């Protein structure tokens, strides 16, 4: 394929952002559900 530099950078950014989202959103949801439970 020989992808361009911009496309490779975008792929790396996408992988990092996917990992960060999968971590942070799940953590925030877990934090919220326990508070909603104890109320």
């Amino acid at each position: 394929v020989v992808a361009s530099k911009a496309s490779s950078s975008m792929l790396k950014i996408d992988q990092r952002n996917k990992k960060l989202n999968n971590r942070f959103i799940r953590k925030a949801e877990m934090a919220a559900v326990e508070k909603r439970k104890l109320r």
């Binding site: 361009s4 911009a6 496309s7 950078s9 975008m10 790396k12 950014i13 990092r16």
Partner: protein, 67 residues
């Protein structure tokens, strides 16, 4: 298709900051911090770089019609 030259709302030139924005995002900076480092204060300008989709990288993958 490709990053617009001027911001639609006010008219600031944002067409020269796409490569710098991608370089900053490559280094792990967050999108808000990257936009702040480029001195994009007004959110009208921030939406131009934040919501741009780069389609020319898909058009360029087709074999050129001439040679």
């Amino acid at each position: 298709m490709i990053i617009p030259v001027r911001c639609f709302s006010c008219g600031k030139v944002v067409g020269d900051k796409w490569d710098a924005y991608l370089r900053l995002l490559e280094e792990g900076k967050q999108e808000g911090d990257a936009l702040d480092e480029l001195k994009l204060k007004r959110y009208c300008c921030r939406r131009m770089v934040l919501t741009h989709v780069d389609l020319i990288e898909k058009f360029l993958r087709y074999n050129p019609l001439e040679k």
